C-alpha cells in the first residue's frame, strides 16, 4: 500500500549526529488514522523500537534513548527524519522506518506497523571509509562454479549483482565477514553449465556506496 | 515496563507440518499483540495484528489467538518460504518492544554439499596477498567440517567462513571457507588442499590444486 524508503549516512563517528530521512510514496505523510516512527535492529538487542511522531504532532521516545532523539516530519517533501545525537559503537544497528496505524480511533494502545523501509545500516565508527578490490574467482577446467572475492571494504555493506542483474539462479552471495584487519570481505558465487564457459560472458557488479566504488569484473576461465 | 517472552527459540520442522510459537507478556495487555515475520536480508513483515486480525496478503495458513498475556502463533502448514525469525510485539504500553524471536528452520532430507575450490588470482597476488576459496554448495544439513592442508600441514587460525541463510527454494545451505596467506608465505608451498566432511558424504572430499599450475 506504502513504500518507505531510508537514506542518509552509513558511517558515522562517535559523539556525532545520526540522521536519517524516510521518504514516503503512495500516500501522505498526513492522516488521521496512521502516523511514523523508527525501530533499529542489533544481533544482540534484537529489535528496539525508537520513538513515533503522532498526526497531532505529539512525540513519543524510548525512555533509553530519550534524551538524544528528536524525529520530526515534512509533509511538504512527505518525508520524516531521526536524529540521534552523541552516538556510540552501541548504537550500530539496521534503523527501519515504519508507519504506525492506530486501530482504534485517536488511541495510542493497540498500534501495528503497517510498513518498514528495507532498512538503512549505519556502523558507528572513528575508521575511514574504504572501497572494495574485486578479484574473479575463475572456473575450473556438467556444471561449474565462478565467482568474485569482494575484499577488505567499510563500513557495510556492498551489493553484487551478476551480468547487470540478468543472471539470478544459481547465485550465493555470502554474508560479509570481518576480518582482524578491520576490513570486511565476502564471495559471491554462481553455478552455471559447463557448456557455456566460453560462449557466455560472466561479469559480477560490485556497488559500494558509502565510497562511491562501482567495479565491473569479467570472470573467465583460465 | 513490559517485557515479552517467546518460546521455542529455535525448533526446525518438515514441510507442511505445524508450527506453534508462544508469546508471553510480564503483563497483561489485551489482545494488543502483534506478529511479524523476518526474512533474511528484508525487513520484518506484518502477519497478524491485534491478537488475531490476519494481514491484507498474509497466507490463511498463518493465525493468531490470545489475550491476556498468553499468546500463539500458528503456522498449519509449514512451507520454504516460511523460512524466517518471528516475533512478536507488545503495544500495550510505549515503549513498544518485540520478543527476542523464534527461528524457524525447514528440515529436509540430506543433501551432499558439491565441493570446490579456487586459486588467488594473479592481480591479487601482484598487490601481495594470496586468498584461497573453497566452496561447500547446497547442502543439508548446516553441520558441516572444512580443513585446510597445505602441502599436507593441517592449517590453523588463518581462514574464517560463512554461511549463507537456508535457500527459500530448495532449503539447503552454502558455506565458502577462505584461507588467507601473504604472497611471501603462499609460494613456499605447492598443494594447497580443502577437505570436507558432512553427513551427506561416506568419507570425506577433499579439493585441490598445485600452486602455477592449469
Known amino acids: 500500500q506504502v513504500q518507505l524508503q531510508e537514506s542518509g549516512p552509513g558511517l558515522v563517528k562517535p559523539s556525532e549526529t545520526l540522521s536519517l530521512t524516510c521518504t514516503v510514496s503512495?500516500?501522505?505523510?498526513?492522516?488521521?488514522?496512521?502516523?511514523w516512527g523508527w525501530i533499529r535492529q542489533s544481533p544482540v538487542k534484537g529489535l528496539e523500537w525508537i520513538g513515533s511522531?503522532?498526526?497531532?504532532?505529539?512525540?513519543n521516545y524510548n525512555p533509553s534513548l530519550k534524551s538524544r532523539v528528536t524525529i520530526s516530519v515534512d509533509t511538504s517533501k512527505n518525508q520524516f527524519s531521526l536524529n540521534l545525537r552523541s552516538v556510540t559503537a552501541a548504537d550500530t544497528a539496521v534503523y527501519y522506518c515504519?508507519?504506525?496505524?492506530?486501530?482504534?480511533?485517536?488511541?495510542?494502545?493497540?498500534?501495528?506497523?503497517?510498513?518498514w523501509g528495507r532498512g538503512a545500516l549505519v556502523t558507528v565508527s572513528s575508521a575511514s571509509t574504504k572501497g572494495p578490490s574485486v578479484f574473479p574467482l575463475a572456473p575450473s577446467s556438467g556444471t561449474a562454479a565462478l565467482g568474485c572475492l569482494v575484499k577488505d571494504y567499510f563500513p557495510e555493506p556492498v551489493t553484487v549483482s551478476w551480468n547487470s542483474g540478468a543472471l539470478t539462479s544459481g547465485v550465493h552471495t555470502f554474508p560479509a565477514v570481518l576480518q582482524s584487519s578491520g576490513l570486511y570481505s565476502l564471495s559471491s558465487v554462481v553455478t552455471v553449465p559447463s557448456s557455456s564457459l566460453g560462449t557466455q560472458t560472466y561479469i559480477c557488479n560490485v556497488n559500494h556506496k558509502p565510497s562511491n566504488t562501482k567495479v565491473d569484473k569479467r570472470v573467465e576461465p583460465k | 515496563d513490559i517485557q515479552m517472552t517467546q518460546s521455542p527459540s529455535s525448533l526446525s520442522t518438515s514441510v507442511g507440518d505445524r508450527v506453534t510459537i508462544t508469546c508471553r507478556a510480564s503483563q497483561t495487555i489485551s489482545t494488543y499483540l502483534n506478529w511479524y515475520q523476518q526474512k533474511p536480508g528484508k525487513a520484518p513483515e506484518l502477519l497478524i495484528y491485534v491478537a488475531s486480525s490476519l494481514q491484507s496478503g498474509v497466507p490463511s495458513r498463518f493465525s493468531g489467538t490470545g489475550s491476556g498475556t498468553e499468546f500463539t502463533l500458528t503456522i498449519s502448514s509449514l512451507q520454504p518460504g516460511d523460512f524466517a525469525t518471528y516475533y512478536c510485539?507488545?503495544?500495550?504500553?510505549?515503549?513498544?518492544?518485540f520478543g527476542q524471536g523464534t527461528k524457524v528452520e525447514i528440515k529436509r532430507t540430506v543433501a551432499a554439499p558439491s565441493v570446490f575450490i579456487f586459486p588467488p588470482s594473479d592481480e591479487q597476488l601482484k598487490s601481495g596477498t594470496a586468498s584461497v576459496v573453497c566452496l561447500l554448495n547446497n547442502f543439508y544439513p548446516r553441520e558441516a567440517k572444512v580443513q585446510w592442508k597445505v602441502d599436507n600441514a593441517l592449517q590453523s587460525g588463518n581462514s574464517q567462513e560463512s554461511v549463507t541463510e537456508q535457500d527459500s527454494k530448495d532449503s539447503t545451505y552454502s558455506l565458502s571457507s577462505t584461507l588467507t596467506l601473504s604472497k611471501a608465505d603462499y609460494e613456499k608451498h605447492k598443494v594447497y588442499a580443502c577437505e570436507v566432511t558432512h553427513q551427506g558424504l561416506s568419507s570425506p572430499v577433499t579439493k585441490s590444486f598445485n600452486r602455477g599450475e592449469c
Open positions: 515504519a508507519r504506525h496505524v492506530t486501530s482504534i480511533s485517536s488511541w495510542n494502545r493497540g498500534v501495528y506497523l503497517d510498513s
Open positions: 510485539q507488545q503495544s500495550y504500553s510505549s515503549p513498544f518492544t
Open positions: 511522531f503522532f498526526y497531532s504532532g505529539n512525540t
Open positions: 503512495g500516500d501522505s505523510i498526513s492522516s488521521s488514522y496512521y502516523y
